[PDB]
Amino acid sequence: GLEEFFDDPKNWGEEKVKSGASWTCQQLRNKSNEDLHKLWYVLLKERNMLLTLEQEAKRQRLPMPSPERLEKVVDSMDALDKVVQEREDALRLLQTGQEKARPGAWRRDIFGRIIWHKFKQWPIPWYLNKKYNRKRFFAMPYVERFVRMRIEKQARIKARKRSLERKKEKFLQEKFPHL
Amino acid sequence: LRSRVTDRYWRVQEVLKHARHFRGRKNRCYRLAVRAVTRAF
Amino acid sequence: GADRMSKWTSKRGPRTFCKGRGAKGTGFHGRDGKFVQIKEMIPELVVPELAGFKLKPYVNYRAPEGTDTPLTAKQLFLETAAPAIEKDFKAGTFDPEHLEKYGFEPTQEGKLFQLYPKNFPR
Amino acid sequence: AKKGFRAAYRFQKELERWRLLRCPPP
Amino acid sequence: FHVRVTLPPRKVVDRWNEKRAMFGVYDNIGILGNFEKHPKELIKGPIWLRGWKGNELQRCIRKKRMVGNRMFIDDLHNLNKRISYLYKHFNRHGKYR
Amino acid sequence: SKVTLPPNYRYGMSRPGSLSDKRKNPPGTRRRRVPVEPISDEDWHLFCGDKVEILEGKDAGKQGKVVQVIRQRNWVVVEGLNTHYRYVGKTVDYRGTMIPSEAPLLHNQVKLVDPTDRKPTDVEWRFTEAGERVRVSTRSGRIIPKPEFPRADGIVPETWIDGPKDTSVEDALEKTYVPRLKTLEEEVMEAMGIQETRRHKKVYWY
Amino acid sequence: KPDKLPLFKRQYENTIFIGSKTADPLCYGHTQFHLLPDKLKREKLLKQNCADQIEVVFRANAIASLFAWTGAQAMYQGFWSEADVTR
Amino acid sequence: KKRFTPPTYQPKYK
Amino acid sequence: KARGNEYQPSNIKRKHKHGWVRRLRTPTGVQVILRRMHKGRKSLSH
Amino acid sequence: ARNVLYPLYQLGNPQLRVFRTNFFIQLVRPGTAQPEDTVQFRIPMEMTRVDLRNYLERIYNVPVAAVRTRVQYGSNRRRDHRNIRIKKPDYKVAYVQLALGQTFTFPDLFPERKGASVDVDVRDQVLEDQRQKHSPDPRRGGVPGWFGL
RNA sequence: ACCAAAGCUAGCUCAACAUACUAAACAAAUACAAAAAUACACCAAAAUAAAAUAAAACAUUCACCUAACAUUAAAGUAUAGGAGAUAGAAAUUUUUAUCCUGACGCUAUAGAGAUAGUACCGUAAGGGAAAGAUGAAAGAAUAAAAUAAAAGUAAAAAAAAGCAAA
RNA sequence: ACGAGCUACCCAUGAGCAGUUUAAAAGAACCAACUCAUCUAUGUGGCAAAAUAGUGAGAAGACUUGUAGGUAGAGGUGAAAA
RNA sequence: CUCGCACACGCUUACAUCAGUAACUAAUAAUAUACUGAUAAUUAACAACCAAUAAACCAAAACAACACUAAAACGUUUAUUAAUUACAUUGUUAACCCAACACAGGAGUGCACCAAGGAAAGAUUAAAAGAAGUAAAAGGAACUCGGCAAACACAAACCCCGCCU
Ligand SMILES: [Mg+2]
Ligand SMILES: [Mg+2]
Ligand SMILES: [Mg+2]
Ligand SMILES: [Mg+2]
Ligand SMILES: [Mg+2]
Ligand SMILES: [Mg+2]
Ligand SMILES: [Mg+2]
Ligand SMILES: [Mg+2]
Ligand SMILES: [Mg+2]
Ligand SMILES: [Mg+2]
Ligand SMILES: [Mg+2]
Ligand SMILES: [Mg+2]
Ligand SMILES: [Mg+2]
Ligand SMILES: [Mg+2]
Ligand SMILES: [Mg+2]
Ligand SMILES: [Mg+2]
Ligand SMILES: [Mg+2]
Ligand SMILES: [Mg+2]
Ligand SMILES: [Mg+2]
Ligand SMILES: [Mg+2]
Ligand SMILES: [Mg+2]
Ligand SMILES: [Mg+2]
Ligand SMILES: [Mg+2]
Ligand SMILES: [Mg+2]
Ligand SMILES: [Mg+2]
Ligand SMILES: [Mg+2]
Ligand SMILES: [Mg+2]
Ligand SMILES: [Mg+2]
Ligand SMILES: [Mg+2]
Ligand SMILES: [Mg+2]
Ligand SMILES: [Mg+2]
Ligand SMILES: [Mg+2]
Ligand SMILES: [Mg+2]
Ligand SMILES: [Mg+2]
Ligand SMILES: [Mg+2]
Ligand SMILES: [Mg+2]
Ligand SMILES: [Mg+2]
Ligand SMILES: [Mg+2]
Ligand SMILES: [Mg+2]
Ligand SMILES: [Mg+2]
Ligand SMILES: [Mg+2]
Ligand SMILES: [Mg+2]
Ligand SMILES: [Mg+2]
Ligand SMILES: [Mg+2]
Ligand SMILES: [Mg+2]
Structure with missing residues (x-):
């Protein structure tokens, strides 16, 4: 069962090994679970095979035979993932109605940033947990100042991105006055 | 409105032309040359 | 001046510093100091028999794609619960109290794979 | 870069003068 | 002192473009307009500078009074320092006393 | 694979991720921005494969097939028309094979030609009654087709032969889906006859 | 290389020791009894998909231990690499 | 006093 | 006697003195992190 | 499976199962001499010994006797044109040893076709003949040989 | 003839408007020695700003100085002050919409520090750079095209005597 | 604000001290490792922002030394040399 | 000619193989442990990670017989509970670290004094002055602030000040 890592020996020395198109999402939505x-x-066995071939090509200082396959396969698997995910996320929207499969909350950390905090699984409840208890979600009063600075910095950047674009227009209008 | 001196070249030449026939670095470098030319006149 | 930028890894510190590369723990430390594995923490791969089945890693080129419709909670409702609900309302047997026959689940804590706290990896 | 025509033009004259000094026209 | 070797593209300004041709049109709006709007109203610009003028010190002082609380931190701080410097300079330094 | 280009970049007809390109403009090159007339993707009337006429250059009044377009710099390539000559094969003793090569053209120097009378025309985008979007000539008042063209793979779908690892049209288009409310896990575990009893103890999330 | 066995290099005092010091009047071996450690149980090996190894583990032990023992005895009698061995 | 001026290097990129 | 070798590296010391945790255990340390964030430093802390 | 959450295990919990595994594997040729027992893989950083054993046995049906792993550190030394450091990514290497006395050998994936190599030597002799044909005539002394007279 | 020289872009500056104000990106991991799934706790807090400086010293005093209320005046007036330096109101008054947003602002030693808070320098807080220029096309490098003008040299060592010239 | 990874003094916890002389491991003696830094010559943009060569002083102790921790500037620490 | 092998701490691929070196690193070449590229690599038995609560124990380490004073690091057993189930995770290269350098400097421990490591001289010539050494007739401190330095010497006395380490 170790040969599944290699292409059929008929293909070994050959430049071009042709191959089909990757699976569209659509084609997969039709298939059962x-x-x-x-x-x-x-797809997995094929991906392993292709990765092996890839590295072994690098080893021999030779170009890999029809590298494009590796792309296609990945997309396929990727596409497949996207499908199964849908069927779950649709389903839980029905049953529970939560949009996120992992419990989480909007919090404000020490730095005053508004962060999305993913939760974690623990055998004990939160008020008995040493490690968790010594995190701080809240900002102290000094932090306020910095928050302001953040805003301002941000505002500046936006401000002069905008002015840039505007300018790029004027220039072009005198370069190509076809209006 | 930033203004820079564009023609500085000619300003320099009006000094240096009198210094061409001097010996040494006086005939090149505007500093030394300016002094030497003034002494010449 | 040491190194600020390069990431902090088990290779870097003293003997006393061991930080895993992110593999998941399979067990705990036992009595003898020896390590004990818990058969339940080790992921069991579920692999179907592929031999007698026809599908391939690639698709024929002349085979068509299709108009792309992302599955929505609505479409899934209509392909499943809508025929049954319509059948039992048209017969007047519809019961707004218990929808469980149609496949609705009131709470997740009973069943093996729960959706919202998400009990399963993949 | 410095913004103006004047010095550029005035220099074009110098370029011409040197061009005539290095190759005199018949 | 090297000077550019190539003639710049000759820039043609048409003096008859819209903004130049219409220039200074409503400047007499008070006199001819049965005084209602003073020519100040025609001034486009910074809120603290419309129809008003002053040396740099007065200018900064006024900017702070008017828009000071809408300013960014760094700019407000810089404005204060500027004011303190100008104050000190104008009041305590100079030839003429 | 997506190669991310530096914010200021020149487009040299060489494929941006290629040896010709890395050799022309190495990792640190920042050149002067070439002003490009902005064109919304919906105002862009030139595709590859359509017969066009050249209004400028040494070859003018001629007509050719558009091979490649470069949208970033607003360019077309009309094969074997706009031309200058270059050597390809090279070694120390031998300069081989002088090849005619194509200089790209701006879209101002190229006018799209309507099939019927073979004249150059001003193309304008129109919506017809069928919900279709077609190019319509201003001068001649006709609709101009769109140039169906081969693709980068060199693979034509009509003539094709399935290999060992290709799936047939039949088995691919087949719909096996039965839209029911179990997950992949429940489905598979039920199908493989895998029997599980125990349930998870309460977990605290935070 | 022996490394792929796996085997590991280390450095510390190299001892030749018979189970007793040289000064001891009993210089010779009779028999050894080796109890196989827990990791090497027939059961554990059967779980690891090692069947044949059951035998190997025994062999190896003897071949090492005994060698060492005999070797040590031999060097207590003054034999070594350049004196080889008479009996 | 003991007066001493510590030498200062130039930036390495030069 | 001879000087300049003042820095004698230890990772434990490094991370206890200047590390992330140490910077977050006091208000002042947090203000350090905040300043560095503001300036946009690539490395906030050791 | 990797990058995914695992359910916390407490006493008397269900057996944890992964239906679609995330992992991926390269079978690689050893850089050093190795016993015939031994196969060598590059695996993802987060895959355990046990993981790889189960992976091999279940998906590929390989009789695995023993597995050892190590983490190879990629060099951070090479510098960008900006003088920023580039990191060749770290990776995990696995040595596996086969059970039933089964011997492996890393196959040659690039045997050369003799017809294509003979066509290469013939194309090189033809190119050398073309460069010998274009080569100037010693006795012409640099007079262009286009003109008849 | 070398070394060199020349570009006009990258972007910036100042205002206007504006909704409203912590951007982008989050699969996993991140407050164990941040980026290390998983065990019985602790957790948290506030006290007037000061001084350099001005008063030709310095001792009370010294506008502004991280507290929304603008504008025209009342007015630098009443007042307050080692009655010195300086500080300084109010009552009371005035204020007409929205569109016409741009530039007698910079153009690579300038304009932002910024190609970047990166390299590099500091144990740390922290400090903090330099650098670009072909053309329609280089899928036109026996490559084609317009400066050859800084100091420094080379082409070309020197020949009594002297601020080097007149 | 940041600093005790150098150094001053502490706290924990480890580690070294061979030969000779002596009833003695006695802040004894001779003399290595080890620690210091006496005198001279080199060196003085140096091998070195305090070194090299010789020569010296201590060397079971108020000794040397590793690791981790502490004390912070109106302060600390100090067998006081500010 | 002799600072060797290993571990800790630290460094972070600088290690290995093949190839290249016009120029870039080596304060110069040859060529390459240090420049460039490609490809590989350190595999656990060593090391890290690796139980709590009660209860009995006054009795040093020093070859420990027994003692000294400054009164001393280091655990058994009994009881009560401790998921019980192959293979967990992580360190494993180097000619290396701190001194701006490929720095005569600074660097803990265990074993060794060679079986391991290394090269004082790019090639000449054989001027002065300078450095480092060996030898020196007769004299023996006459030198000099001082027997500083040197020596085939390596001894004796007396003051001042501090008791002493
Ligand atoms: Mg640093
Ligand atoms: Mg470590
Ligand atoms: Mg280590
Ligand atoms: Mg184990
Ligand atoms: Mg320093
Ligand atoms: Mg290991
Ligand atoms: Mg004063
Ligand atoms: Mg004064
Ligand atoms: Mg004074
Ligand atoms: Mg004050
Ligand atoms: Mg009074
Ligand atoms: Mg007075
Ligand atoms: Mg700049
Ligand atoms: Mg700058
Ligand atoms: Mg010159
Ligand atoms: Mg004369
Ligand atoms: Mg300390
Ligand atoms: Mg002793
Ligand atoms: Mg003594
Ligand atoms: Mg010495
Ligand atoms: Mg001597
Ligand atoms: Mg000595
Ligand atoms: Mg002594
Ligand atoms: Mg003594
Ligand atoms: Mg400390
Ligand atoms: Mg004071
Ligand atoms: Mg004090
Ligand atoms: Mg002391
Ligand atoms: Mg005193
Ligand atoms: Mg004193
Ligand atoms: Mg280093
Ligand atoms: Mg190498
Ligand atoms: Mg060299
Ligand atoms: Mg080693
Ligand atoms: Mg020499
Ligand atoms: Mg001499
Ligand atoms: Mg001499
Ligand atoms: Mg002598
Ligand atoms: Mg004599
Ligand atoms: Mg005398
Ligand atoms: Mg005398
Ligand atoms: Mg002496
Ligand atoms: Mg004597
Ligand atoms: Mg004597
Ligand atoms: Mg004394």
């Missing part, structure tokens, strides 16, 4: 589950492994 079981068949996706299988196709995942079919």
